[PDB]
């Protein structure tokens, strides 16, 4: 008996967000859950890992109820309808009836009872921009399908008052810290699965907006008023990353981010397609870059850098270095090195908020 | 390639 | 002993065009043929079906020779180099040596003697814009991998003085005619393979330019001064398309191209994903469109049309109708129909230069 | 679907 009227654009906005998480084994998983309670329409999409909820206030008289309908089909019908049209939606004999202007649609349904949180340990509000920065500055370093399952995601840590993101695949690490002034009384850690965290970052579009965060023992919740995002957590312990951060780095290199990125990209063309190895030769004011492949093709480049100290010959995966440079927001970049067998520490020119660790390759 | 752990 | 200097942008333009045809069984096929003859550099790319030649005038003193080098690698190196840099290229002990500023590259080579046109029957000049129109108005109708190999391409026909393109897959046909005033003395037909014709249309970017055409017994040649395009022809006889063009169409329908496209796109969502069947119900001033799928989902729409005559119920593949509407350049579209078992004839509102034939589906 | 030939 569920029935409501809605403007095309009012339905389209939450429908597009929700359909984005809809990808399926169970047939109901391909469906969007529609719930009319009073003058509110709720739209829910899930893949069992993440759940996204969109909400719309209904203007004209609406009859309550709940149903599930093919998410992609309803979104495509909504998108294809003329701009600003009023859509009439009703449930009739296990079918969804859609009317808009001279267009009529009948969709198959699945019962809402078949559609598939968690006390909060910590809850705080944060700028969408600050949370998105933490994810976007580190997400490239997360492992993908590593047997060490706890690496296939991002650590979100609250400590002191600081919110920190940590991502690693065992070869390289990315970390970003922001003083959000969150009272915690203890260090709190959560591992958000890779698919979930990447979805969340894409949802954080409000440059001026705020997001309410709830950290639970097995879930994370992000609320913006227009949407509620819920993700299950990776049930494991994140490695002791503090133990792998290089501390005694004696070789400080200051270089131009663009010059280094351009030289690494040029040399990468002639590096091994699988191993992506490049050789770095550091000396006073100079960085020599060399790359070669099995066909004996070779690329060489010399980059002027701010460096005074002893020589260093070190091997690196060029893609790992390019990944780091792609997230450095300053014109200059700091590389802190020691020996050929030890990690490179990378920072922005003017702050230590972001830190990148890259293990070398044997030459 | 070397490992962090 | 081959050696020359060239500006980044001067090399990049023909290199990008030529690399576009490079896709490989034989290793030399992955390579670009570089030929220095006097103060001219020629760049050749081939897949054995199509051959593309780019030419550049060399400013500084150049030493003659010929060699082949990996096309994608050289293009990527060229693209990655700083804007406006002078590139020094030389052959040294079966290797290509590339120098530009502080960058050095060594590429593997394959002998030019290992790198792989009959007499012309007809040759004429035509505006690039007119030839591109003939291809773009009809290319969607070509078959792809059909057992009737002669359909996997486009017919280019010179008759009277008119240049005509014909494309068909056995279900639908697209044709476009332009009076280019080409003297021929007899009707001349060539079948250009689908890959070749689509490559040629993409190359006809000079909105301002002219193209020299040569029709041979087994080849087609297109010359623009900056490039020479050569394609082998499909060795077969194109069907007698004139026999399948509907002539006695008694039902003239004039509709709005956008309104019909929007209604067809909306209904298409609920049509069978594979068979794409829609039902048309034509009556005085009205076109009723219906679509249904195996899940029993249904879409219905009514479109006002300029039509006075007897009723008609006819089935069509909606994708075939959308393909036609996507190439109609006028605000209004003419549909000429007869019975439920006969083809639809489609034209632009103000001319018969373009003609589209769509066989119906059994309801 | 019907055929042109």
CB A116 within 8 A of CB A28: yes
The phi, psi pair for A9, rounded to 5°, reads: -65, -35
Domain boundaries, chain C: 1-116, 117-246, 247-363
CB C255 within 8 A of CB C287: yes
Burial of A68 (0-12, 13-18, 19+ CB in 10 A): buried
Task: Please give the distance of CA A201 from its chain centroid, rounded to a whole number.
Answer: 4
Residue A102 forms contact with C (CB below 8 Å): yes
CB A346 within 8 A of CB A358: yes
Tell me the nearest-neighbour CA distance from A305 into chain C, angstroms: 14
Distance from first CA to last CA of chain C, Å, rounded? 71
Q: Which of A346, A347, A343, A345 is nearest to A360 (CA)?
A: A343
Show the 3-state SS of A36-58. Answer: EECCEEEEEEECCCEEEEEEEEC
3-state SS class at A12? helix
Structure tokens of C7? 């500006």
Going by the DSSP 8-state scheme, the letter that residue C142 receives in this structure is S
For residue C171, the number of C-alpha atoms closer than 13 Å in the C-beta half-sphere is: 20
Q: Which residues are bridge partners to A256 per DSSP?
A: A332
Structure tokens of C116? 């792989």
Q: Which of C225, C199, C194, C196 is nearest to C212 (CA)?
A: C225
Q: Give the C-alpha separation, C169 to C143, whole Å.
A: 4
Q: Give the C-alpha separation, A140 to A156, whole Å.
A: 15
Q: Give the C-alpha separation, C307 to A190, whole Å.
A: 66
Chain C neighbours (≥3 Cβ pairs under 8 A) are A, D
Structure tokens of A255? 């270089």
CB A211 within 8 A of CB A223: yes
Greatest Cα pair distance, chain B, in angstroms, is: 12
Within chain C, residue ranges assigned H as helices are 8-19, 71-80, 128-136, 194-203, 257-268, 318-325
Contact between D1 and C171 using a beta-carbon 8 Å cutoff: yes
CB A313 within 8 A of CB A281: yes
Distance from first CA to last CA of chain B, Å, rounded? 12
Q: Give the C-alpha separation, C77 to C89, whole Å.
A: 12
Reported CATH class of domain A117-246: alpha beta
- Chain A to chain B Cβ contacts (< 8 Å): 26
Task: Please give the distance of CA C265 from its chain centroid, rounded to a whole number.
Answer: 25
Tell me the nearest-neighbour CA distance from A244 into chain B, angstroms: 6
The string of DSSP codes covering C320-350 is HHHHHHTT--SSEEEEEE--TTS-EEEEESS
Residue A271 forms contact with B (CB below 8 Å): no
Q: Which residues are bridge partners to C200 per DSSP?
A: none
The string of DSSP codes covering C60-90 is S--B-EEEEEEHHHHHHHHHHSPTTPEEEEE
Residue C11, number of CB atoms within 10 A of its CB: 23
Buried b (16+ CB within 10 A) or exposed e, A257-266: bebbbbbbeb
Q: Give the C-alpha separation, B4 to A146, whole Å.
A: 14
Name the residue in chain A with its Cα closest to that of B1. A361
The fourth-level CATH superfamily of domain A247-363 is DNA Polymerase III, subunit A, domain 2 (3.10.150.10)
Sign of the Cα pseudo-torsion (C110, C111, C114, C116, in order): positive
Structure tokens of C1? 């002993």
Q: A47: left (phi > 0), else alpha (psi -120 to 50), else beta?
A: alpha
Residue A297 forms contact with C (CB below 8 Å): yes
Q: Give the C-alpha separation, A325 to C17, whole Å.
A: 31
Question: Which helix (H) or strand (E) element contains residue C124?
Answer: strand C120-127
- C359 contacts in D (CB within 8 Å)? 1-4
The string of DSSP codes covering C181-215 is ----SS-EEEEEEHHHHHHHHHH---SS-EEEEEE
- Method by which the model was determined: X-ray
Q: C38: left (phi > 0), else alpha (psi -120 to 50), else beta?
A: left
3-state SS class at C140? helix
Going by the DSSP 8-state scheme, the letter that residue A269 receives in this structure is T
SS3 content of chain D, % helix, strand, coil (to 5): 0, 0, 100
Selecting from C107, C262, C297 the residue whose C-beta is nearest the C-beta of A108 gives: C297
Residue A216 forms contact with B (CB below 8 Å): no
Q: Which of C89, C176, C169, C162 is nearest to C132 (CA)?
A: C176
Contact between C359 and D4 using a beta-carbon 8 Å cutoff: yes
Burial of C48 (0-12, 13-18, 19+ CB in 10 A): exposed
Selecting from D1, D4, D5 the residue whose C-beta is nearest the C-beta of C361 gives: D1
Tell me the nearest-neighbour CA distance from B2 into chain A, angstroms: 6
Q: Give the C-alpha separation, C270 to C3, whole Å.
A: 62
Q: Give the C-alpha separation, A77 to C270, whole Å.
A: 9
The string of DSSP codes covering C262-281 is HHHHHHHTTS-TTT-EEEEE
Domains C1-116 and C117-246 belong to one CATH topology:
yes
Going by the DSSP 8-state scheme, the letter that residue A265 receives in this structure is H
Q: Give the C-alpha separation, A76 to C270, whole Å.
A: 10
Q: Give the C-alpha separation, A120 to A184, whole Å.
A: 12
Contact between C107 and A297 using a beta-carbon 8 Å cutoff: yes
Sign of the Cα pseudo-torsion (C138, C141, C142, C144, in order): positive
3-state SS class at A136? helix
CB A362 within 8 A of CB A279: no
**Rounded (5°) CA angle C194-C195-C197:** 65
Q: How far is CA C74 from CA A270, C77, C97, in A?
A: 10, 5, 11
Peptide bond into C351 cis (omega under 30): no
**Entry field: residues in chain A:** 363
Name the residue in chain B with its Cα closest to that of A278. B1
Contact between C171 and D2 using a beta-carbon 8 Å cutoff: yes
CATH, range C1-116: 3.10.150.10
Selecting from C73, C266, C300 the residue whose C-beta is nearest the C-beta of A269 gives: C73
Q: Give the C-alpha separation, C130 to C164, whole Å.
A: 11
Query: Quick one: CA torsion of C317, C320, C326, C332, rounded to 10 degrees?
Result: -70
Q: How far is CA A178 from CA A172, A185, A208, C131, C181, in A?
A: 21, 17, 17, 59, 72
Q: Give the C-alpha separation, C258 to C325, whole Å.
A: 8
Tell me the nearest-neighbour CA distance from C227 into chain A, angstroms: 27
What are the residues whose beta carbons fall under 8 Å from the beta carbon of A352, sequence distance 6 or more?
A: none
Q: Give the C-alpha separation, A299 to C103, whole Å.
A: 8
Contact between C295 and A108 using a beta-carbon 8 Å cutoff: yes
3-state SS class at C261? helix
Residue C127, number of CB atoms within 10 A of its CB: 17
CB A336 within 8 A of CB A353: no
Q: How far is CA C282 from CA A257, C288, C290, in A?
A: 65, 6, 12
Burial of A255 (0-12, 13-18, 19+ CB in 10 A): buried
Cα Rg of chain A (Å, integer): 25
Contact between A80 and C302 using a beta-carbon 8 Å cutoff: no
The phi, psi pair for C130, rounded to 5°, reads: -70, -40
Q: Which of A2, A220, A226 is nearest to A93 (CA)?
A: A2
Q: Give the C-alpha separation, A196 to A201, whole Å.
A: 9
Going by the DSSP 8-state scheme, the letter that residue A187 receives in this structure is -
CB C246 within 8 A of CB C338: yes
CB A137 within 8 A of CB A327: yes
Residue C296 forms contact with A (CB below 8 Å): yes
Contact between C80 and A296 using a beta-carbon 8 Å cutoff: no
Residue C76, number of CB atoms within 10 A of its CB: 18
């Amino acid at each position: 008996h569920m029935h409501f009227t809605i403007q095309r654009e009012a339905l389209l906005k939450p429908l597009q967000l929700v359909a984005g998480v809809v990808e399926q084994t169970l047939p109901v998983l391909s469906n969007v859950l529609l719930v009319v309670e009073g003058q509110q329409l709720s739209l829910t999409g899930t893949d069992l890992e993440v759940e996204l909820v969109g909400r719309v206030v209904l203007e004209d008289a609406a009859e309550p109820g709940e149903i599930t309908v093919p998410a992609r089909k309803l979104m495509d019908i909504c998108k294809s309808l003329p701009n600003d049209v009023l859509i009439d939606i009703r449930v009739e004999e296990q079918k969804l009836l859609v009317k808009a202007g001279r267009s009529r649609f009948t969709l198959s349904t699945l019962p809402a009872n078949d559609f598939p949180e968690g006390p909060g340990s910590l809850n705080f509000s944060i700028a969408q921009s600050k949370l998105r920065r933490l994810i976007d500055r580190t997400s490239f370093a997360m492992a993908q399908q590593d047997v060490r399952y706890y690496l296939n995601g991002m650590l979100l840590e609250v400590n002191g008052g600081t919110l920190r993101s940590v991502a690693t695949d065992g070869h390289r690490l990315a970390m970003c810290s922001l003083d959000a002034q969150i009272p915690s009384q203890d260090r709190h850690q959560v591992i958000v699965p890779r698919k979930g965290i990447l979805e969340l970052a894409r949802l954080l579009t409000e440059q001026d907006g705020e997001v309410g965060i709830v950290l639970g023992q097995h879930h994370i919740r992000a609320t913006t008023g227009e949407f509620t995002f819920t993700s299950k957590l990776v049930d494991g312990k994140f490695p002791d990353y503090e133990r792998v951060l290089p501390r005694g780095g004696d070789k400080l290199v200051v270089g131009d981010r663009q010059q280094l990125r351009e030289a690494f990209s040029r040399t990468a063309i002639l590096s091994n397609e699988k191993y992506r190895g490049i050789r770095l030769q550091l000396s006073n004011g100079l960085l020599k870059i060399q790359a070669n492949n099995p066909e004996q093709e070779e690329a060489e480049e010399e980059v002027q850098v701010e460096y005074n100290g002893g020589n260093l010959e070190i091997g690196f995966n060029v893609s790992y270095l390019l990944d780091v440079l792609g997230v450095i927001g300053t014109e200059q970049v700091r590389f802190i090195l020691s020996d050929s067998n030890s990690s490179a520490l990378v920072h922005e020119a003017d702050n230590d908020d972001s830190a990148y660790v890259v293990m070398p390759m044997r030459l | 390639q070397a490992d962090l752990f």
